[PDB]
Amino acid sequence: LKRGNWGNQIEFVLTSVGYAVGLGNVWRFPYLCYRNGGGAFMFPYFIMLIFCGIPLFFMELSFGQFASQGCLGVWRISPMFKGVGYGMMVVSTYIGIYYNVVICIAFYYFFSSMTHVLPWAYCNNPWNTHDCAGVLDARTSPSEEYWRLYVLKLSDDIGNFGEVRLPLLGCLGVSWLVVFLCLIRGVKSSGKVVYFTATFPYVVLTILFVRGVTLEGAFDGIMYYLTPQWDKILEAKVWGDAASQIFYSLGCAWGGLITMASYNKFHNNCYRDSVIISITNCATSVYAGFVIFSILGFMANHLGVDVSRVADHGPGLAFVAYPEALTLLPISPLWSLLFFFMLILLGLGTQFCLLETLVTAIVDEVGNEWILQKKTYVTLGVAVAGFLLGIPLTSQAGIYWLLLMDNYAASFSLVVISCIMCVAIMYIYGHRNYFQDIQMMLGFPPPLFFQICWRFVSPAIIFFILVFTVIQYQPITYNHYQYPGWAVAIGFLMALSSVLCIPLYAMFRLCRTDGDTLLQRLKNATKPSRDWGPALLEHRTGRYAP
Numbered sequence: 385l386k387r388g389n390w391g392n393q394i395e396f397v398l399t400s401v402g403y404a405v406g407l408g409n410v411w412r413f414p415y416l417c418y419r420n421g422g423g424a425f426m427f428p429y430f431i432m433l434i435f436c437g438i439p440l441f442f443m444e445l446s447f448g449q450f451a452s453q454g455c456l457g458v459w460r461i462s463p464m465f466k467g468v469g470y471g472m473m474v475v476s477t478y479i480g481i482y483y484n485v486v487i488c489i490a491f492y493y494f495f496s497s498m499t500h501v502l503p504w505a506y507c508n509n510p511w512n513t514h515d516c517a518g519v520l521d522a523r524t525s526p527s528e529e530y531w532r533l534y535v536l537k538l539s540d541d542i543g544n545f546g547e548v549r550l551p552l553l554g555c556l557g558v559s560w561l562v563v564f565l566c567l568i569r570g571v572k573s574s575g576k577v578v579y580f581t582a583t584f585p586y587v588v589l590t591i592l593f594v595r596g597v598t599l600e601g602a603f604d605g606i607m608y609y610l611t612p613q614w615d616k617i618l619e620a621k622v623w624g625d626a627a628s629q630i631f632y633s634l635g636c637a638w639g640g641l642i643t644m645a646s647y648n649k650f651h652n653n654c655y656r657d658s659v660i661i662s663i664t665n666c667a668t669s670v671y672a673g674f675v676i677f678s679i680l681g682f683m684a685n686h687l688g689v690d691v692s693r694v695a696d697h698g699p700g701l702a703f704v705a706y707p708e709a710l711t712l713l714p715i716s717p718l719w720s721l722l723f724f725f726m727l728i729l730l731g732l733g734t735q736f737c738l739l740e741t742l743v744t745a746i747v748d749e750v751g752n753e754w755i756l757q758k759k760t761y762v763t764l765g766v767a768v769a770g771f772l773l774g775i776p777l778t779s780q781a782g783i784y785w786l787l788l789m790d791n792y793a794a795s796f797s798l799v800v801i802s803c804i805m806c807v808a809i810m811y812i813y814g815h816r817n818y819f820q821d822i823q824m825m826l827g828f829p830p831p832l833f834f835q836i837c838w839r840f841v842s843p844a845i846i847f848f849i850l851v852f853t854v855i856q857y858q859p860i861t862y863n864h865y866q867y868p869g870w871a872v873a874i875g876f877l878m879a880l881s882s883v884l885c886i887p888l889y890a891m892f893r894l895c896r897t898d899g900d901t902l903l904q905r906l907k908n909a910t911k912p913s914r915d916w917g918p919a920l921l922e923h924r925t926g927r928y929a930p
């Protein structure tokens with residue numbers, strides 16, 4: 385009755401843009417483009433986005449908006465399959481715990497960059513070794529030694545915690561305080577903040593791109609980026625890497641979209657917004673690639689090498705590679721400040737949803753007016769429980785546990801959840817009723833291109849992603865470190881804490897549904913319950929209730 389709505393469509397579009405666009409469009413996409421084809425990777429990138437990225441986004445947005453419920457209350461089409469919803473909250477917990485620990489290396493670097501001389505420029509600090517060979521000395525760069533010997537003192541084993549790094553506990557406190565203070569009212573509070581932490585990164589990117597373009601030696605760094613190698617598109621690996629990147633980057637099956645769309649009005653165009661956001665998210669990765677590769681080309685020119693020795697994948701690029709290249713520009717503590725501010729803003733627009741997704745559930749599932757008057761207390765209850773649970777990741781052996789949670793927990797549990805949820809709404813509920821349900825909202829039948837892509841093509845692409853992820857599984861390794869057996873076992877058990885919630889809840893539900901034959905018990909608890917439909921009595925007309 386008092387759930388509330390957004391108020392402006394611009395708020396919803398900006399919030400979704402800031403939630404989908406995260407840190408995966410800055411360090412992941414450029415390296416993939418450089419490695420897998422060059423300028424010929426965009427053909428598999430933009431062909432597997434039309435047939436796999438837009439249909440899934442549209443289906444999730446239309447599913448969330450119809451029944452004005454979060455990621456846990458929309459499963460009234462088949463109450464037995466509610467284990468999928470509980471699978472969307474476990475994974476969103478993991479991505480809500482280790483994401484704030486990445487915010488130290490953006491906050492700590494930002495706070496340590498307010499100096500007239502960058503601390504990682506010259507190799508004369510007492511924490512250095514004999515291999516300080518760099519470029520700015522008046523092979524080991526003096527940004528890697530700072531990264532692994534002063535910011536975090538890396539140990540020699542995953543189970544070798546030595547002490548908690550207090551400067552990192554400081555960021556975690558500050559960051560959780562900011563996250564809680566920015567969600568003090570929810571929709572009426574975050575909706576007015578996304579006007580800032582969704583657009584400033586574009587200004588920062590434009591400034592950095594201009595500086596890179598006018599910089600000498602940059603045109604040789606953009607040629608390697610987008611020169612076509614058409615041979616690569618003839619392989620199956622390139623078509624298997626352009627399907628996983630689209631699926632993961634769009635933010636599919638973490639919840640969020642189903643809980644953002646739950647606040648929209650009933651008669652809202654879910655087709656225009658499903659295309660605008662999808663195109664905007666995929667049009668930022670190219671710009672980020674340009675920005676990164678211009679300065680990388682300048683760096684390679686300065687050290688007089690081909691651009692193959694100065695390319696890094698993840699945290700080794702944003703903290704070991706890019707900062708080591710910004711130190712050659714005239715006014716470095718300003719470009720570094722802007723870059724780390726952009727990283728902080730990019731990583732902070734996603735954490736808002738990962739806290740509001742878990743609050744909306746716990747609020748609506750219980751069901752009361754007492755749980756609505758004290759939503760801020762609930763929001764504080766989850767923030768202080770994500771700070772105590774993220775302390776072990778700030779110790780000496782923090783990087784080891786950081787990479788084991790992003791490669792096992794939220795790696796293939798997401799693909800399984802989406803595949804099952806596709807089957808649940810298409811062939812169990814019925815693909816002939818969902819089309820009429822969507823037509824009731826949009827006002828026109830879905831385009832024919834979307835009916836053939838929702839029943840045959842997209843599930844096939846999901847199956848292809850699932851199969852390709854199994855044939856190309858290798859044990860996780862960090863640099864030359866080899867993870868022991870117990871770490872792999874812990875990671876596998878972590879990955880089994882989300883996809884194992886579907887069979888258990890199904891058994892629990894069918895162990896209490898009154899029936900005679902198991903086929904009849906399966907027949908029940910799989911039909912829409914008598915609460916499926918619009919939440920307002922003014923919209924219920926025709927097929928759904930008198």
Ligand SMILES: O=C(N[C@H](c1ccccc1)[C@H]1CCCCN1)c1cccc(C(F)(F)F)c1Cl
Binds near residue numbers: 412629632633698699
């Ligand atoms: O950004 C990262 N993964 C993203 C992701 C998205 C969704 C879920 C999980 C992970 C990628 C996955 C692949 C497709 C594009 N998005 C990443 C990479 C290396 C190290 C780290 C660290 F160290 F911070 F954990 C991270 Cl967080």
Ligand SMILES: [Cl-]
Binds near residue numbers: 413629
């Ligand atoms: Cl991407």
Ligand code: NA
Binds near residue numbers: 404405406732
């Ligand atoms: Na983001």
Ligand code: NA
Binds near residue numbers: 404407409633634635
């Ligand atoms: Na992302």
